[PDB]
Amino acid sequence: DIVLTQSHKFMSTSVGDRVSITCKASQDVGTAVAWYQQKPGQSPKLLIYWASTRHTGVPDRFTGSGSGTDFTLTISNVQSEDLADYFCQQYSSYPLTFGAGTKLEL
């Protein structure tokens, strides 16, 4: 059972800054990691897959990186529309698992 531990539960920042959220897997998952963005009362939206590939529609502002057991989501210039929850997910082996999430507040 691959556990995904996200660094912090909450993270503060204001528009203009650069943020990095980390995801550590309890086992090697190669690069089979995806990041999702979720605003309240809405469904998750895919941002990055295969650790660093941007999905159709996500802005260059988001950049994923890492491999093996340490993954990171980076937002270089945090805009207001980026304040939301962020989850990492592993899809190398069952059961598929998610990280607890990291809330981005001002």
Next chain:
Amino acid sequence: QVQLQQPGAELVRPGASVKLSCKASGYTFTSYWINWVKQRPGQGLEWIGNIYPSDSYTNYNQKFKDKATLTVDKSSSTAYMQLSSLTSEDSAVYFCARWGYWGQGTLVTVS
């Protein structure tokens, strides 16, 4: 383009079963795996299991295997999930998803 329509809410009585639907449209229903995810306000997301529409092959979370059953209806392109012996712990938002597209979710409230 792709759409995974799920009904907004379901009110269920404790100890009973619930049947959740997920109508897919805008892509070939049989070429993509459909996953079911559970979300309770307090905790993170939790994977229940998945199903491959073409042959109904399923994978379940060890935590949800006898509690949930996954099936599809290839003629209507709908995926279904049933939960039984519902309790307060099952009240949550359940989402059906495929690569790149999640449904709106259905709020299951046991009361």
